[PDB]
Amino acid sequence: ARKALIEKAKRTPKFKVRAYTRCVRCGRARSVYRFFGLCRICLRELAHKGQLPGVRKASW
Amino acid sequence: EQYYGTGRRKEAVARVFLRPGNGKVTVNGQDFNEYFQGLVRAVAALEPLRAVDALGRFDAYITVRGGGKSGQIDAIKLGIARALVQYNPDYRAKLKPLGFLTRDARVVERKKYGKHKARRAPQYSKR
Amino acid sequence: GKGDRRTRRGKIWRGTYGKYRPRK
Amino acid sequence: ERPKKEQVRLKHELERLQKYLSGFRLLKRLPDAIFVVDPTKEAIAVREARKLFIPVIALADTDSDPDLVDYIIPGNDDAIRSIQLILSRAVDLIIQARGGVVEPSPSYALVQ
Amino acid sequence: GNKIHPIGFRLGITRDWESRWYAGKKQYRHLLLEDQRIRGLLEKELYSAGLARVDIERAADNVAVTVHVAKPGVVIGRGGERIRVLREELAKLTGKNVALNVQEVQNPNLSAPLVAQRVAEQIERRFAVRRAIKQAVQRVMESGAKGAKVIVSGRIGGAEQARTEWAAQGRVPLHTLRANIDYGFALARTTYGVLGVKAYIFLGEV
Amino acid sequence: KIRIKLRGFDHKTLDASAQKIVEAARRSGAQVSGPIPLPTRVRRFTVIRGPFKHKDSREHFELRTHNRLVDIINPNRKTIEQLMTLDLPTGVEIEIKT
RNA sequence: CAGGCCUUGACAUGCUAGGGAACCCGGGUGAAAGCCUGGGGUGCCCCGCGAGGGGAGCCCUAGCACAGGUGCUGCAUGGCCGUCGUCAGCUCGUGCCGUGAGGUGUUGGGUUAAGUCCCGCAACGAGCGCAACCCCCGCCGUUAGUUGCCAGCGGUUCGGCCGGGCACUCUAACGGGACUGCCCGCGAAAGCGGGAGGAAGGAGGGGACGACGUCUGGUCAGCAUGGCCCUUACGGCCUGGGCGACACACGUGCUACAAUGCCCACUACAAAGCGAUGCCACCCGGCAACGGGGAGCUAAUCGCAAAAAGGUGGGCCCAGUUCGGAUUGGGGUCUGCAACCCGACCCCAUGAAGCCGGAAUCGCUAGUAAUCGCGGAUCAGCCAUGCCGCGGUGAAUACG
Ligand SMILES: [Mg+2]
Ligand SMILES: [Mg+2]
């Protein structure tokens, strides 16, 4: 019961209350970042790759 | 005319000045003994000025900005010591012998993840 | 203490304002 | 260049390299034979040579077992006396098949 | 298993971002969902040439879409017809003016995401994994390299017992930053499950 | 008179291309208050390394937005041709106000 | 989970067929979903005065191949993480001893945070680890100045506000610094102890980095994926319920049982981030939540903003209390179609247990522990006392 939902989330024909987020690459609704449009997993994944502009490993 | 010292310590920054004269001391446009009123630590800052003997020879004007009401006092004690080492080369025998010269690297460390407060780890169950 | 809503600290810790901690 | 680290290092490295290989350069080929003082001392060596069929000459005494030496020099192996007397006239008979007959070699400097 | 991504770890030094532009908060998620969806079809219809990088640079409505390939004789086509329909497929979804440069490969044996795919394939073809690894390493070194390390996951020969094949030579300092160690990961979709291939081509020190 | 912002990410490129517009603006007339560095805007987000359930030893990265301002003092018709056409930002941004 | 519905299916693509085809606005019934039903009429490719007719996209109906599954197996797997463990370790090459498993190196002496290094030695090298390269605070400098300052003469409506200025401060880019190179003491060396100089020595203090491997560890529920299992349903829509149920028990945490204190008025000092139907200055309405207007910000230039503890003097006087805020009644406000389940905030009144905690047990060696306040992310709102960051005050002790 994941496929129908990934599209049901884009679809905003119903109240803006129910209009939550959803990771772009994978159908992950949790730990979604408004900025990247990914979840915690993918974020870390792309950042390790470099496909994340100016997104670098922290070292302070 | 003016005698300047570079005060700084633990995210605090004091700009100290010294015009020969009375003995009064100012900090951020308010009397020294009035800004630091209730801190029994305050009068400790002017401690290098009591090992040099020249407190009433220098009207101190300081503008410290940042840190804490006490962290500022620590920075001030560097710029009260660093300011009278500049205009006096023989006054090096109180900034080294009576250690008055170091920014005190004693800074707050980073809080590590899985360490409530950088080192204080959480509660241990085992059970 | 910091739990009694009706106080200056009970209003602070709970990050809200009221009769007992108005905006200046 | 090279930080003061690699200078102390690479130096030392050449130092010891040298320390042990001052004379083990020369020929980059398996010695046609080997001459040795106390064969029971550097028998390890003698073994190597022996396992390679490399002919072996050496100056052994009673401390040393004859059998396993191809060419045998029976005599003192400690007092610097006999050592020079057999090293000398051996390295002397060496060059006397190349030309250049000389006087004896440096030996006395504190020789007793 | 542990060991942080050698790519994400060098990112600071050595490896320059494989997508180097900017975007204020307002719009970044979209240039992100773009760059991403783009690599989605450039890695499909172009893998036959076998691409080992897709750099993408920007400024204001133009795109780099630079594709590095070891075999650009399928990227350009038969005179200029192929890439003609690839600047078409690009701007087809992207409402911008998408260019498209192309670099070659000064050694497909010295590119990791290349050797990682080079092995990935041999596995779906039922090759001796041991030999397919000891090989894809002995290929990188005979071809101008200081270090090579090739790692296969589980199910070698399809065995119900998932193993872990390990092959290296020379030096591969993964704890170093001056490592310039190329790396890339290819799969393999055999009938007996999934496989994995890690490629560790240590290049130049300093 | 004219203000020009330089936003972006990389401080090596955002630095070279903000020093170029410093020698080619003095050569085009009015003086130009050199490359000034204003505070860098960080954006650190923390993500749990484990894909599953491993609340501890996680991993977080940053996003360093390096600002850099440069001001030209007098609005020639000279500089207006050097700058309006010498647009060479590789992964950089530039605003212009007055 | 109960109930009410839909099957070329909520999403992919391919093929066949008269009709209509791009799209917009409705109506009836209903909890919604769904089912049924009433209305304008189309730029296209083109023989054509035109009617009209072929027709490519898309769309609608039928049918077909198939979609879909958070259904099972993490001992069938990928990927990725936890872990012993920042542990000093783990191996290969050739030679060498051994019938062989396998030794040797990597043992031995000394040293170190360490297979750190030196000296030894049938071994000599090398790899993965260690260290080093990378980032932060440090001490200082060059470049650059709209943050900053009677720092200097200056005018100043008496606020860096105006002129005016890069010295400060800072901001941020790049360099210098520390290396057992100087003196003493031990030794063959590695090296240690002691001292001067220095902002800083013997890795300077914190990060990022975690070896062959181990736990048939964890995850098919993020995803990927082998096989199995389901298909008018183990798929799919929706209304409501549920994950918040409660006689209990454990874990992690918050606030405390008080005078080193609680309460009120008034007065000071941080750092890091964050903000367009977003952070709200200043006003007025309200005890207040909040609400009517409304300046400013693309944000070192305005806003969140008040930092709190602390400083000043004032009331409680040891009292289940002005200690302690659960519980419950009544009245409200904001987001939202919707606060009964089951939201947080606000006001009045309820003012429960607890007067320091059995046995057991947890954390930390210095800006640490304790203690106080702030941001961020997620997010309409929020049951955040959580988590990741930040700083103000600042110890106790280490014989062994
Ligand atoms: Mg070593
Ligand atoms: Mg410790």
Ligand SMILES: [Zn+2]
């Ligand atoms: Zn994802």
